[PDB]
């Protein structure tokens, strides 16, 4: 695909500016919507039976979810009749906005189409653009920080760290992993919104650089834990120590960068006399980690798949942001631990 | 709003506003004094300073005050059926 | 009323039906890129649907650059079309 | 041919709003009325 | 309310008479001659055919699909004859705050006719035949919507009455002067027969000859009307009869010339050739009325 | 000339309808702002009162007299 | 008789029963026809001809129409009756006594709601609006503006551009 | 709430029908005085319940000139009214003629005065009545804001986290 | 208050409508039309009764984009014709 393909792909970068610059309710509804209108044609690709099921799946559901946002923007006319972005000013409306925003996002209970969209997806150019696309739904939650109920998001928060936990343990699709980690690591987003709303700008940050280091190293093509498998000895060895340090960054571990969520979520939360709730988040993560500990036996190991067919010549991909983003992603702990005033 | 637009103009939000050629707004007064009120930050986290102002405000696009005084004043009506009823009209 | 003038011409056009049937005794998929070329030509007629109606009173210098702008983008929808379109 | 119709509909089109803008026992009118609606509206409030 | 009777049974006449019309004209452009055994000049034909196919003329059904076949006529019969309330003829029965949206929405709406129509028979080879017919209706609105915003933005809002007062002295043929030949192929639409063609039989054609008359009367307001007269209503509509049935005679004149298109050629001609000159024009109908002062 | 001469006959030879859809729509942008005759259909536009008058309240100002005929306020004649 | 906008919702909602119901696309399709062309009528009696025919024109001229192919494409030739068909029936009959049985509680004006908002009377305060205005009026006399709402024109014709470019890369 | 007596409407008002009002537009330029004075009551007052005094003072000088009307040029002007109401929807247009038969007759009188350009918002300089700031609607002054910080910030703690 | 008891009521019953299936996938976004057309309903009479003339556009735009979705979603439903022989929810592939 020439020109035509990066127009489509500026029309999504285009319509979440408009989520972003906006005051208008019906602003950023367009924005939304502007983006389905988009994902859809990288979403088929390939002329693929799964990429037709995928996209019918992820329309279905998130078609849905705007029409139950524009509910929440119709009941803002039926109620005070100001039409700006910053209060519901409704215990009703507040209901539908809140599950509205969590059916575009991972959250725990519009989760199941998740994993099946991302098996449908064709290539890792098309698997950055969910990742990516969580921005949008998480820009307007920050805008409309109060006026929403704590019983109806943090709920939303704790079940899908729990269901993320124990929704990758029985999956050995590398797409179906990353898949897991996007609902698991939603819920480390939404739970510090009515605690400050800053940090949850942090965690996408975070967050979207170090999915973006994943599908970016593996375009050497791999779909199966079997098939990353093949990397140790027929392939690069180098390559393994880097996808190691995204690996376990992903987890709560000190070290690398990826405690730095982690680092503040707590932090903040424990400053309003919260305590019995952060035990449960730190607790549920180490399933979130118990994922990427079998799938670092993948690299250190041997595993026995060296297959005949040797590769001589040199692998050259895109590689865009492969070498960049995971020396950020890797330690940036010791490097920026006041970045939270810089970013929010 | 995430990030600001500043230097450029793309509002015309809120009711009461710039009129299409002098159209009014049906709860016109009522948002001068509700805008007015809270133009600074004192009743936006509070929301208490402003609460006069507030409930006569969603009296006018609702009308759910009228409407229960009009059901009282429309049953002790029927209530006259068959006693001391007259109609000038 | 409208109701008035509605109902008479359904009332009349369904009883035709009645003497119609009461008294006597004894696959290809290119058609579907049409429907969606129309639909979607429907809401950008339905945006300049507005012309002879909203020119009378706004200011011109700031409707032309956009009234023109929207059948721009309708011809330039077209300009996409003719590079491969179809043998119907 | 056209243009210069226009420009004569022009003339019309001011003295048909002119006629509007003159008119103000119009408007009083509408405010005379309820006045005297909201006293009989208040006549059946003390009655019922 | 007696006016509403007066615009639906004189108003079937029109279409029975038409029959007649159809067969004389198109016969004398064919050096043969029109009825004459029937009547005295064949007059008495259009209630001969009236008796012979709904009395006696039965229907074999090919399924009946229990809500369709005959909901279809409803669709049929019933648009077409609402189409005639809000025309501008003296003083129009009960006038719409916009005229021409009314006219635009329910000839819009008389594409599902021909739609349920398709959906009545079981045989795929039907309603296969069906959708094409579909195609030609559907395709040949959108310029008929672009025509239209384009007449108007040169004179008059929505209103139908309007249009009237901007033909005073000046027919609108010659300021809209390539859009004049446009409209006229544009509304060969509804299954005209002369660009392609495809209950009972009878009463189908009931409602697509009934449609030809609104057609004919709706170019002689949007082009024609020459003058009002407020103080004679009869010397307006004795003028608009003979303008009218001009433009009657020239539907049966492009039916009896001219062959068709190939249904693929008649697709070619939109798109192609007729929507790049008519959004041109619509281009040049946006600027006339800020270059020269003439917003009404 | 390479191809003012050359691409413009052949246009006309072949299909010469996309020759008026170029032409005629070019001519519906830049006559507009050439032509010294769009400031005169902008005066009457605002001059045209949808709305009813509003009266002013005056302490010492000008350009401002009653309703009946007097030199003041705006009020276009622009060609009768 | 005095009512006009109630008498009209109840034939809105009865439209949308055949929706929560599922009696084949084809009868499904015979709803947005119904329940349409009523909620014209709804949006017509408040004021606003223009907004009111826009479904008409869209819903009623287009939507449904291409909606109309797609039932031949896939799913075509018959439907299937209805009243034999199970549970569809058991959601029709449930769905219509969500609203009739409602509406013996709004006679004698007010009722009791799942929602705090009350029924009320509905006739004399159906209109809500005095005179308000004259000339060019009634809020939907200038509708529509290309001024002043700019930013709105451009992002509406991107999407456009978007629609037809996409689905021709689908198929 | 408290409204107006029953005896606050002014009596003789309504005589004359909608299209005879609308067939002389010179009320606009005879009696104009009293028409602005109730005007610029309205947008410095909203509220109908103090501005009605001045509305008797409009009721009073609207038949001050019609009465004038029914003294003189009565045939001139019914003529031109019964042209007015026989056309549909024009008003103004297929009256011409009977236009120019009107207001000769009134040329004979000082009443004759029509304006070929508008009204274009003429100001009432001679109007007292009542001062324009009362406190329309507002009640509450409403609580003042938070004190705006002046001066620069210096860097003290430089970073209050767990480290540096 | 009245007319809002019903189109929101109609909404509620679209919203159920959409997610319970008898394994027709055309029936589904028959009901996405629904859905735009009770939106459209409720936005219109609390624009039109709350004089507000510069919002009267903003359902003109909804009309747009409620088109938007239901002709691109609609192109995907052929997509899946296309691929198996006729369109159901229960013909799926997907883990």
Not at chain 8, 60 to 77: D, Y
Not at chain 8, 78 to 102: M, N, P, V
Not at chain 8, 118 to 137: A, H, I
Request: net charge neutral; charged share 15%; with cysteine.
């Amino acid at each position: 695909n020439p020109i035509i393909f990066i127009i489509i792909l500026l029309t999504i970068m285009l319509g979440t500016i408009i989520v972003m610059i906006s005051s208008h309710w019906l602003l950023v509804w367009i924005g939304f919507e502007m983006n389905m209108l988009a994902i859809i044609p990288i979403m088929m690709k390939n002329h693929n039976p799964r990429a037709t099921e995928a996209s019918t799946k992820y329309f279905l559901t998130q078609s849905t979810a705007s029409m139950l946002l524009m509910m929440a923007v119709i009941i803002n006319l039926m109620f005070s009749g100001q039409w700006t972005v910053m209060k519901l000013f409704n215990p009703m409306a507040s209901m539908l906005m809140t599950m509205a925003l969590a059916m575009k996002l991972g959250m725990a209970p519009f989760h199941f189409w998740v994993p099946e969209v991302t098996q449908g997806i064709p290539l890792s150019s098309g698997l950055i653009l969910l990742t990516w696309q969580k921005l949008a739904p998480m820009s307007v939650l920050y805008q409309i920080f109060p006026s929403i109920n704590l019983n109806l998001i943090l709920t939303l928060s704790v079940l899908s760290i729990l269901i993320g936990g124990w929704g990758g343990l029985n999956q050995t699709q590398l797409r179906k992993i990353m898949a897991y980690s996007s609902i698991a690591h939603m819920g480390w987003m939404t739970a510090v919104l009515p605690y400050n709303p800053t940090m949850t700008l942090l965690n996408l940050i975070i967050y979207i650089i170090m999915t973006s280091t994943m599908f970016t190293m593996f375009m050497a093509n791999s779909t199966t834990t079997t098939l990353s498998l093949s990397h140790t000895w027929n392939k690069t060895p180098i390559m393994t120590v880097l996808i190691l340090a995204t690996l376990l960054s992903m987890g709560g571990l000190p070290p690398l960068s990826g405690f730095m969520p982690k680092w503040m979520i707590i932090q903040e939360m424990t400053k309003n006399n919260s305590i019995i709730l952060p035990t449960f988040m730190a607790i549920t993560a180490l399933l979130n980690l118990y994922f990427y500990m079998r799938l670092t036996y993948s690299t250190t190991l041997t595993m026995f798949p060296s297959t005949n067919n040797m590769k001589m010549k040199w692998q050259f991909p895109l590689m865009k942001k492969m070498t960049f983003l995971p020396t950020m992603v890797v330690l940036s702990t010791m490097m920026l631990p006041l970045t939270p005033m810089l970013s929010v | 709003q995430k990030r600001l637009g500043v230097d450029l103009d793309r509002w015309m939000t809120i009711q009461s506003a710039e009129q299409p050629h002098g159209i009014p707004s049906r709860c016109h007064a009522f948002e001068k004094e509700w805008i007015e009120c809270a133009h600074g930050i004192g009743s936006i986290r509070a929301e208490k300073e402003c609460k006069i102002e507030f409930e006569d405000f969603r009296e006018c696009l609702l009308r759910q005050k009228t409407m229960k005084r009009l059901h009282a004043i429309r049953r002790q009506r029927e209530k006259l059926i068959k006693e001391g009823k007259y109609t000038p009209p | 009323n409208l109701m008035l003038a509605l109902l008479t011409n359904f009332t009349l056009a369904t009883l035709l039906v009645i003497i119609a049937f009461w008294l006597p005794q004894l696959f290809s998929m290119k058609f579907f890129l049409v429907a969606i070329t129309f639909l979607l030509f429907d809401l950008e007629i339905a945006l300049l649907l507005p012309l002879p109606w909203a020119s009378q009173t706004a200011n011109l210098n700031t409707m032309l650059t956009m009234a023109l702008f929207l059948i721009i983008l309708l011809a330039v929808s077209l300009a996409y079309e003719w590079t491969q379109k179809g043998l119907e | 041919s056209m243009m210069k119709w226009n420009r004569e509909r022009r003339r019309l089109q001011i003295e048909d709003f002119e006629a509007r803008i003159a008119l103000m026992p119009l408007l009083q009118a509408e405010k005379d009325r309820r006045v005297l609606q909201m006293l009989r509206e208040n006549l059946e409030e003390e009655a019922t | 309310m007696i006016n509403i009777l007066m615009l639906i049974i004189p108003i079937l006449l029109a279409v029975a008479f038409l029959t007649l019309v159809e067969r004389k004209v198109l016969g004398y452009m064919q050096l043969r001659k029109g009825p004459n055994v029937v009547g005295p000049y064949g007059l008495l034909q259009p209630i001969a055919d009236a008796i012979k196919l709904f009395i006696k003329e039965p229907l074999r059904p090919a399924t009946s699909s229990a809500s369709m076949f005959i909901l279809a006529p409803i669709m049929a019969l019933g648009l077409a004859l609402t189409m005639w309330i809000p025309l501008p003829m003296p003083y129009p029965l009960i006038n719409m705050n916009l005229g021409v949206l009314f006219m635009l929405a329910m000839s819009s709406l008389a594409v599902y006719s021909i739609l349920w129509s398709g959906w009545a028979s079981n045989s795929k080879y039907a309603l296969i035949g069906a959708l094409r017919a579909v195609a030609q209706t559907i395709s040949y609105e959108v310029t008929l919507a672009i025509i239209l915003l384009s007449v108007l933005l040169m004179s008059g809002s929505f209103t139908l009455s309007t249009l009237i007062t901007t033909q005073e002295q000046m027919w609108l043929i010659l300021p809209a002067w390539p859009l004049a030949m446009m409209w006229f192929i544009s509304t060969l639409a509804e299954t005209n027969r002369a660009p392609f063609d495809l209950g009972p039989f009878a009463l189908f054609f009931m409602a697509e000859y009934a449609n030809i008359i609104m057609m004919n009367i709706f170019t002689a307001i949007l082009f024609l009307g020459t003058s009002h007269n407020p103080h004679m209503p009869e010397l307006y509509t004795i003028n608009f009869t003979i303008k009218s049935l001009l433009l009657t005679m020239s539907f049966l004149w492009i039916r009896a010339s001219y062959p068709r298109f190939r249904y693929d050629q008649l697709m070619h001609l939109l798109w192609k050739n007729f929507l790049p000159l008519t959004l041109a024009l619509c281009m040049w109908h946006v600027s006339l009325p800020i270059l020269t002062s003439g917003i009404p | 000339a390479e191809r003012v001469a050359a691409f413009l006959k052949n246009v006309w030879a072949k299909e010469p309808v996309l020759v008026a859809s170029f032409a005629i729509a070019g001519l519906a942008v830049i006559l507009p702002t050439l032509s010294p005759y769009t400031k005169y259909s902008l005066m009457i536009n605002x001059x045209x009162x949808x709305x009813x008058x509003x009266x002013x309240x005056x302490x010492x100002x000008x350009x401002x007299x009653x309703x009946x005929x007097x030199x003041x306020x705006x009020x276009x004649x622009x060609x009768x | 008789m005095l009512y006009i906008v109630f008498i009209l919702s109840v034939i809105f909602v009865m439209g949308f029963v055949g929706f929560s119901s599922k009696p084949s696309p084809i009868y499904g399709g015979l709803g947005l026809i119904v329940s349409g062309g009523v909620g014209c009528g709804i949006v017509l009696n408040f004021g606003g001809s223009f907004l009111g025919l826009m479904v008409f024109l869209i819903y009623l001229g287009g939507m449904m129409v291409v909606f109309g192919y797609t039932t031949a494409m896939a799913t075509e030739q018959y439907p299937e009756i209805w009243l034999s068909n199970k549970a569809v029936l058991g959601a029709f009959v449930t769905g219509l006594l969500m609203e009739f049985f409602m509406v013996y509680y709004v006679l004698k004006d007010k009722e009791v709601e799942v929602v705090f908002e009350f029924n009320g009377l509905g006739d004399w305060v159906i209109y809500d609006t005095g005179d308000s205005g004259f000339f060019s009026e009634e809020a939907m006399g200038i509708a529509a503006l290309y001024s002043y709402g700019t930013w709105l024109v451009i992002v509406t014709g991107w999407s456009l551009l978007i629609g037809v470019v996409v689905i021709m890369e689908i198929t | 709430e408290l409204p107006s007596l029953e005896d606050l409407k002014v009596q003789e008002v309504k005589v004359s029908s909608s299209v005879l009002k609308a067939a002389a537009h010179h009320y606009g330029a005879q009696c104009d005085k009293p028409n602005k004075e109730f005007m610029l009551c309205r947008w410095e007052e909203k509220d109908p319940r103090r501005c009605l005094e001045e509305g008797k003072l409009v009721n009073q000088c609207a038949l001050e000139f019609f009465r004038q009307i029914k003294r003189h040029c009565a045939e001139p002007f019914t003529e031109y009214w019964t042209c007015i109401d026989y056309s549909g929807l024009q008003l103004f247009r297929r009256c011409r003629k009977q236009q120019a038969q009107f207001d000769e007759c009134v040329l004979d009188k000082l009443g004759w005065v029509r304006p070929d350009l508008g009204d274009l918002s003429k100001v009432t300089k001679v109007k007292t009545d009542r001062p324009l700031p009362e406190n329309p609607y507002h009640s509450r002054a409403r609580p003042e804001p938070n004190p705006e910080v002046e001066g620069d910030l210096k860097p003290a703690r430089h970073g209050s986290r767990l480290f540096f | 208050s009245m007319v809002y008891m019903n189109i929101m009521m109609a909404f509620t019953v679209s919203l159920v409508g959409l997610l319970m299936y008898r394994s027709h996938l055309m029936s589904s976004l028959l009901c996405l039309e629904g859905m735009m057309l009770s939106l459209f309903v409720m936005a219109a009479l609390t624009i039109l009764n709350s004089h507000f003339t510069l919002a009267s556009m903003m359902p003109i735009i909804l009309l747009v984009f409620a088109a938007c979705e239901a002709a691109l979603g609609l192109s995907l439903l052929v997509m899946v014709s296309n691929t198996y022989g006729t369109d159901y929810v229960q013909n799926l592939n997907l883990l």
